[PDB]
């Protein structure tokens, strides 16, 4: 099936806990995969204008590890629950992708999760201004604008709203699209 095939592909790129004990300032993100209308989609947030870091930017749900978290995957799930109301029974964490080094002292660990079909996002306005889906296939033929650094523009056909996706968030979206969609019969 579509979903069994995606999980099987993702498992080949899992690094597991190989870099998880290194002494960094630690953050995790969840890359949430949603199946709709027979295609895979990624779920994105727009950060609240009130936040200190990156207000109003497009990002994946996530945040800083705390002492309650059993492991780095727990960080991602706790933060996703706080931001968009995703509960544990509604997500299956399939793998841990290559981590992102930033600021000389920080390590960001990305997890891919398969989202239940009955989940409906409940944006927490203290943290998130908006939540939206983008089909995974978009990232193979994106609409690129140069700011020089490359920026993607995605327009939702439901309402005409355009979102700018860039940086680590854009890079990770392309990586997931390549892993899941490369070399597939039609
Ligand atoms: C390279 C400098 C930039 C801006 O100052 N650092 C930065 O954006 N840090 C960061 C990003 C994501 C997360 Cl999750 C945690 C920290």
Swiss-Prot record:
Motif (Nudix box): 64-85
Cofactor(s) for this UniProt protein: Mn(2+); Mg(2+)
Annotated protein name in UniProt: Peroxisomal coenzyme A diphosphatase NUDT7
Taxonomic placement: Eukaryota, Metazoa, Chordata, Craniata, Vertebrata
Annotated positions binding Mg(2+): 79, 83
Signal peptide start and end residues: none
Annotated organism of origin: Homo sapiens
Top-rank EC class of the record's enzyme: hydrolase
Site, as annotated: Important for coenzyme A binding: 53
Superkingdom of the organism of origin: Eukaryota
Gene expressing this chain: NUDT7
UniProt family annotation: Belongs to the Nudix hydrolase family. PCD1 subfamily.
Range within the parent protein: 14 to 209 of 238
N6-succinyllysine modifications at: 7
